[PDB]
Amino acid sequence: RVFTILESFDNTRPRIDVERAKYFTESMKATEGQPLPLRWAKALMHIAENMTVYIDDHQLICGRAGYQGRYGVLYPELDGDFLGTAIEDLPNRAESPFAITPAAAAVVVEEIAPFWKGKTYHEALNLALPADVHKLTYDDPQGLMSRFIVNETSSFRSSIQWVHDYEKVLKRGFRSIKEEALEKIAALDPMSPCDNVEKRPFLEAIVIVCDAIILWAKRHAKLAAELAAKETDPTRKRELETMAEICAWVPENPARTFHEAVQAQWFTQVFSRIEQKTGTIVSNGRMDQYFWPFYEKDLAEGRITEDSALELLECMWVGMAQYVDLYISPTGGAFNEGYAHWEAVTIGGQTPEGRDATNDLTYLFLKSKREFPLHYPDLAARIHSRSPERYLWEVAETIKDGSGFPKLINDEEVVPLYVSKGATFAEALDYAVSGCTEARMPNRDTYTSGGAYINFAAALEMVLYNGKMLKYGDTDLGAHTGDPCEFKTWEEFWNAYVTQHHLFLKTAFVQQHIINNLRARHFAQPMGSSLHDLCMKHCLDLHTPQIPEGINLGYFEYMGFGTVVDSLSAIKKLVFEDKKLTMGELIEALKCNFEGKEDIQQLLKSAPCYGNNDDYADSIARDIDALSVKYGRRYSPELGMHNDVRYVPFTSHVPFGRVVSATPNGRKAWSALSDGSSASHGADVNGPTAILQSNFNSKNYGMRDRAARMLNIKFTPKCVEGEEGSQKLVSFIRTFCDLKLWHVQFNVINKETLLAAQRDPEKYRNLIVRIAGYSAYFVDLSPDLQNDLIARTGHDVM
Amino acid sequence: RVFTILESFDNTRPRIDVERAKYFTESMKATEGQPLPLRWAKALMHIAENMTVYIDDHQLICGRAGYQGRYGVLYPELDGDFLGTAIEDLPNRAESPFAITPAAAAVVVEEIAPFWKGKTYHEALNLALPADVHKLTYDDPQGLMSRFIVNETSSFRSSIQWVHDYEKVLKRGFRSIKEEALEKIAALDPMSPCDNVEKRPFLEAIVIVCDAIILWAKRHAKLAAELAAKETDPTRKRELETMAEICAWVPENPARTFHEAVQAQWFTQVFSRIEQKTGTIVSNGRMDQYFWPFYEKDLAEGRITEDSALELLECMWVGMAQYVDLYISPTGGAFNEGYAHWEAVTIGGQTPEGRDATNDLTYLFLKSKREFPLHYPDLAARIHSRSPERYLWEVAETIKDGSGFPKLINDEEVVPLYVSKGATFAEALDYAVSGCTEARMPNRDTYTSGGAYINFAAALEMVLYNGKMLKYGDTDLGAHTGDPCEFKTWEEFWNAYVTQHHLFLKTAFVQQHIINNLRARHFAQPMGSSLHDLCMKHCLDLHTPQIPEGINLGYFEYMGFGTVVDSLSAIKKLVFEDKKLTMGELIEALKCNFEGKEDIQQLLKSAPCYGNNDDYADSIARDIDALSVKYGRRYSPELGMHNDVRYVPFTSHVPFGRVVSATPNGRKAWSALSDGSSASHGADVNGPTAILQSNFNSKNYGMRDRAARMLNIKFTPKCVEGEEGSQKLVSFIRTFCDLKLWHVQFNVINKETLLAAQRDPEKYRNLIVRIAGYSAYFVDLSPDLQNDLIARTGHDVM
């Protein structure tokens, strides 16, 4: 059924598809000078008319952005200058490799790359950064490799995570969006330069893009119909005919049944992939809510069954599992180990009126996740103080499957923060999970720019080596904070750290200022803009830097929180306060990676650590967090946004660690940094509840300039076994909620399974582990990232 | 000790003191034409120089606003036109009578009244309301009596509740404030008219009022020294010397000890009473926080003891119990049965950084309340999702004393609402309870105008009688919505009610627009403004309508929620859907107050009722609430404020009830309406937990335009007996917090105690009951308010 589809692409390397990039380029190279949203819309039409449409074997819904099997899509507007080396490197890349046929290689070199030579966003961004910033961003003059210090993330995705107002599609259809746009055009003053230049072309872009997705849908209806006529098996012939009927109706017209709603949404989400490379892949919204009217009505009218609806969802996810986010740059790839994806599916939470939103579909999605073997969908469960008992129990049972699903997002942290930044309560209460851990208001959010990922572990190294890093030798990178062995008090060391920290923040905000102004000259999002109230009201593409009435919620990342906290905690305690070792002795111990210095290494590992509800380390964490909250509060208004400190790592803590030498917390050189706001590996020796408490102690709830923190916690199977274990997990989630923590997600595994899977990859090919907001096959992960997963403390008693 | 003090005025009618009114008037009549804040400051200086200062027997702190015993104060600027009848009527008034000596009456007629003739705020407001509004406001052309329909509340208190930044006094002292203002004057441009007219006179008033309270304090220090020098008892002589020393220092200078902090805060609190008639009497803030540093240091340094500190607290509250809020108009008196008072004292909650704020002083205040027999202080305990267990347990034990202490205010409802209205998280988290149930940010709140109390039970009556009310005969009051016996569907009845409801809202908002602009011409508050950051920054008196950067949080009252919901529920169910009776039968039964129609009365009492978690009624309640939230959201911006629906009754449900005839829910003519957002009398038949859910069901969490709801619940002693009963209350409080409800407070009493005390007041004269955010002696209450307290369901289980 779905296992039949699943057997068809099992254990196959994804291929790179080129049709979208080819026809995008054929259109774009013919429209130079025209308004970018209009060019994008004409290209989407050109794609809609010329790219291959697929009706896939055994499927009940149709729509692809690429070829049979697992595939990815090319985005030359973003990083087309990487196409040459991606041809050479992608098939053999150690992590997340992609195969490329010779035929598709020829189109890239011959039909795609030439136009984009000298026109990509990454070429423009590399030239746009001033030298002081460039040295902290890239390792070479053409910005082909990051230095993993002040890491910009705008050059390996079109935008950050996004959630469409899919329900708008289901209720109105794209023909309705188009007619609104025509009426708006008719109301313009034809004498007005602003109407003629700022209003008309945007609205014309909306009209075309509506015609584009509809024409694309109707080409499926035709293909399905032609197949139905030649189909000999009656059962399949009725299904093909059903496809021809539904796709002739949606997404042009509002959906009439649950099946149409799935296909309408599926069409919208696939075309979204064709339009742009959304960060983490475009997300899916509160499906258990906006599907509910269709599900409820069909269920009552015998049109659908509990099993039949569950079959259609599985049809949707096997398709999602065939689309792989393609990162052709080495920075993008190392941020996204194991074919990383986060097409967040939100279930549960509250309605816009503050009532609990659990419905039967909520439980179906949970069950759907528990019985679909792939690590799809990216299930995110909303928690609030009145989350029902049965719901939390079912959340706990899903967690105890061991695959890491679902991740938990806390209404009690998001809703107050979002109303404090201008959201009506209805908008905040109705938020969707997006990407790793983010909250989105699909008609109020307007910010789309990838933000800095900052390796603050390197900032600490630059204190130890007075502006330099061992990885980069004598390169003049950071502030000349002075010879650390010349510091007489702890306060001088801390100030040294503070100076490096503000240098990185300062660097990052200059990056974002340039990025936010630059992106609008390279990226447009006409289909996404047509589903956004403010875009339509003010005639502005989503990627415009400022949109009236919008709220801009963006990010800068703190990487290595636990690593830095413990290192600083050790230095303060062991070097300055207890004077158990001198600065030179510590530095000497670091310089030789503790080889021959195992005694100091153990001594350093004995100081107070983050994640133990220990105020000695937790006060250091709070002061480090305060630096980023207060910086954001002060300097974000200049950028017309909320640029908030966030602790969501992707898989960057691996490459960020690969460039940071041995640190005062006892961590070995070049190994992964601590993840998100989790405790540093094996530093939580007081149980799992103290991790939640240290996360609380390390925040600054007196100010609003904060976003998510990603928290990874691992239980052993014994610790959560049985009804008593389910009750503990449920209660632990209630405490997480009460503490106003943003996110939590769990692995449930024995250490020996991870070790065995390293010692025998072929045997444990299907082992799935939760990494950072997503799950992947353990055997696809690099040794360094495996070591991150292994060294995470497994809690046995909770 | 304090029992000796309390024995001296036990069971005595308070007297009306005139000194403040005399010396206020002597100054004001000499300063006509000057800017009002400067005049007020000069008036307060004149009082400071001429009014009697008292060193009271057995006391350890000093400061009075009137004569020995229980006393009240006159504020002729507010309602001086009532002085004539207050001379005749107050000593014999049935509720809350005040005695007045013949000499004090002579001061009033001869030295106070003449100047204020034609100058009072009430005279000005009465003339300023247009005829359409006046008919709904007052029952006579000089506005001497309310009609208890659209009741304005600005005319019987200077302002609404208020909380000073007392901690600023303790930490800075008033000399610092004066010096700040002097520098600000020195920095002015002497050529600038705006500096000369808008800045200098405001700052000159701050200088004077700082000198005024300091001079007033030093006269206490002088008198105490003179008494100590003649004191024969060594113990008492030391107390006088301590008083002489402490009062020469505070509030001029920052406090140095716990004793000084109490005396400084007391001075500020008493002088505030001299400055104006704050609503509910000025409130006291989070004393367990800003007293904590002094308590901890002295306690550690052997300077203070738990018992001595508790003694100093009791000295403050016996003083508070001697100050009685004086309402001379009959409206003010009927709103404030039994000498109602709400000098809110806030304990517990969260710090400005979101950490739990329980400390040892928090528990001492609880113990302090449990061992002081009077219904003082007005203890308010803040609740949040992390209220500690021991804290909730001691709160429950205090509740189990049966006196109504403490009232519960829920962070989880207040804090999101306040940051959504512009408060930083630190300001919101640090809020103080003020008055009945309100939250105050002492340097961000700027709104001070009394709002409407709207008798929506009367609005329903105008549907039953097509714009008229039985109490007022043929007086053409409301909208002519038609003969109710002509309504063919429920929707017509509902629409008629909606029309009257909006008439009352429109009326109240015209009142507030006129009131908010009028008050600045009659009231000024120099001492309160000198403690407010925004006042000092922008040189504006607190009672200015608009103050830059301020947040204006005001109110309009819905009275009779339960009464109206159930009446409508009965009409919807019994007349229109089940057709168990005709409209003519219901009206006939109502007009004769059910006499001869007892069966109809019984049938009407059987419909679904609010407070039972019954969506049939709760959905009506939710829709009525939505009417007022949506109206406020739309039309408050015009007023430059948040004019939010609130359900806090004072004791106005008695006078509001006394003008409403028999209602469709079975309530008898002229009896009390339901209180706050509590269930209507005896309508809650499904336990106390369903009241909380119905309060939740009847709200609209999707919008912010909402303020407090006062909730009264009564348990019998049996329900809460023993350790299990304490745990049940703790558990019930968690559910109250989880549901984001604003307020709850409890009576614990047997119905028979209420009946026995009615049949024999002398025997049960000291019985204390929780009424509406405050507690009072049951025997001081009118029969109508006693019947309200008796009819509240006493719950045996939860």
Numbering used by the authors:
A (entry chain B), B (entry chain A): 31 to 828
Any passages from the paper?
In this work, we report the identification of an O2-sensitive isethionate sulfo-lyase, which catalyzes C–S cleavage of isethionate via a radical-dependent mechanism. The essential O2-sensitive glycyl radical (G•) cofactor is generated by an activating enzyme through chemistry involving S-adenosylmethionine (SAM) and a [4Fe-4S]1+ cluster.
The P21 crystals contain four monomers per asymmetric unit, each exhibiting a canonical β/α barrel fold common to other GREs. The sulfonate group of isethionate is coordinated by Arg187, Gln191, and Arg676 of IseG and one water molecule through an extensive hydrogen bond network. The conformation of isethionate is further stabilized by van der waals contact with Phe680, Ile190, and Thr310. The three sulfonate-coordinating residues (Arg187, Gln191, and Arg676) are conserved in the sequences within the “IseG” cluster of the GRE SSN, but are absent in CutC and other GREs, supporting the proposal that the “IseG” cluster enzymes are involved in sulfonate degradation. The orientation of the isethionate C2 and sulfonate-leaving group differs greatly from choline in CutC. Incubation of activated IseG with isethionate resulted in its conversion to acetaldehyde and sulfite.
